[PDB]
Each structure stands twice: as structure tokens, then as C-alpha cells.
Design a protein around this ligand. Structure first.
Ligand code: NA
Length: 240
């Protein structure tokens, strides 16, 4: 997250770190949201690679023991059937991971609350992106979980020529684009939390930013719109 601030350690208890085995150690690769005790929602493009993955819940600092982490292997990966790795702009950038064990809930580990199906945020709605991604374009991952305030940019605007044009679809949410704050590599698959009727819900799964850099004016960060996939998510979980 570029232009972010350190999160309080109990602010976003549904945030997870998806990590992959790198030699004798593990490395953060993207984010995700805990949606059942044994299911995680992330971006399809995060699990394109044939790696060994684990999920870490209750994580705050990637490089220090927090005393709150639970580490659980990934048992099954279900990517959206329409996903196409070389066409991120076509959408369907979403995947569900079934965990090897069910995690225990506490003040650091809670299920993410999903929006009702079909819900679309009005222009300029207050949202936070969270994650451990790069803190500057071509920079390095954050140590501690970061959060940035990113107001939504509605489809009519985001799909105009000076923003994203045709690349953005109705199945996506855009947020930010002020040129100071944004998502960045390592944030993919992580949540966009939006305050609706007094309750934060996860409205987006971070999907892409501009190749021209993370925080670019009028290239808001693009998220998969979770409310477009409520039935898909239910169907996968019900059949696994
Ligand atoms: Na830690």
C-alpha cells in the first residue's frame, strides 16, 4: 500500500497473508480475506503459480513474532472457471482457498463480512485498502500491516477515456486515483473494506494497478467486485 499508515493490530481481523515456500523459509506474496473458518478469498492471479502456499491469520508484522499468528496449509484451490491469466481486464479475478484446518476466531482473527449481492457503492464512498504490499512503486514490502483511505470512483467515471476506459468492467470496483495513495504489488487478493450503514464490509478483492506505477493520477486501483460473486462463492463452499 502506497501512502498508507500502520494499522492498529485489531482493526482488520479478517485480513490474511498468503505466503509461499521459498527454500527453508516462507515469503509473503499477497493478501486475502478469511470468509469461513476454513475458507479464504483471494485474487485468481495470486495463485497462478504452481507454488506451495500457506495462509497466516492474526498476522501484523511479517518480520517479528506477534504472539497471535496461526499458520495453516492450503488444501484446495478453486479459481473462478472464467478466469484467464493473460486477460486480467476481462475480470473473474477471484479464487477460494480451502484451508487444511479451521482457524480459531478471536479479536485478531474474524470472518470478513460480505456485501449483499448486487450492491454497488455510490461515487466517492469511504473505503480502506489494507495489506503488506510495496510502500512505493518498485519499492519493498511493508513490515507491518498498512491501511490507506481510498474513496470509490464509480463506473461511469472509471470507464471514461482519461481513467481506465474499456479495461474496467461492471464486475469491478475502482478506488483512489489521487496520485498519492493506492494498492501496489503484494497487496493483490487483499480486501477493500467499505463502511456501509455503520459496518465495514469487504467490497473488493485487489486485482490490478497501472503498469505506469501504483499511485498514478486517474488510474485508481482496480478490485474484483465481491457483490458480483456472492452466488459463486456460496456454490463453491456448499459443494466443497
Ligand atoms: Na508476525
Amino acid at each position: 500500500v502506497v501512502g498508507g499508515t500502520e494499522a492498529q493490530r485489531n482493526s482488520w481481523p479478517s485480513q490474511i497473508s498468503l505466503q509461499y515456500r521459498s527454500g527453508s523459509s516462507w515469503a509473503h506474496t499477497c493478501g486475502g480475506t478469511l470468509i469461513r473458518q476454513n475458507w479464504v478469498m483471494t485474487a485468481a492471479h495470486c495463485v497462478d503459480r504452481e507454488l506451495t502456499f500457506r495462509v497466516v491469520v492474526g498476522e501484523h508484522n511479517l518480520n517479528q513474532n506477534n504472539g497471535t499468528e496461526q499458520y495453516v496449509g492450503v488444501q484446495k484451490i478453486v479459481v473462478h472457471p472464467y478466469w484467464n491469466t493473460d486477460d486480467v481486464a476481462a475480470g473473474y479475478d477471484i479464487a477460494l482457498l480451502r484451508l487444511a484446518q479451521s482457524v480459531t476466531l478471536n479479536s485478531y482473527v474474524q470472518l470478513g463480512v460480505l456485501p449483499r449481492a448486487g450492491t454497488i457503492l455510490a461515487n466517492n464512498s469511504p473505503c480502506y485498502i489494507t495489506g503488506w504490499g510495496l510502500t512505493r512503486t518498485n519499492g519493498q514490502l511493508a513490515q507491518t500491516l498498512q491501511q490507506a483511505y481510498l474513496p470509490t470512483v464509480d463506473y461511469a467515471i472509471c470507464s471514461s477515456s482519461s481513467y481506465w476506459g474499456s479495461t474496467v468492467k461492471n464486475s469491478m470496483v475502482c478506488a483512489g486515483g489521487d496520485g498519492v495513495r493506492s494498492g501496489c504489488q503484494g497487496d493483490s487478493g487483499g480486501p477493500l473494506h467499505c463502511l456501509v450503514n455503520g459496518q465495514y464490509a469487504v467490497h473488493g478483492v485487489t486485482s490490478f494497478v497501472s503498469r505506469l506505477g501504483c499511485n498514478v493520477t486517474r488510474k485508481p486501483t482496480v478490485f474484483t467486485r465481491v457483490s458480483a460473486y456472492i452466488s459463486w462463492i456460496n456454490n463453491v463452499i456448499a459443494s466443497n
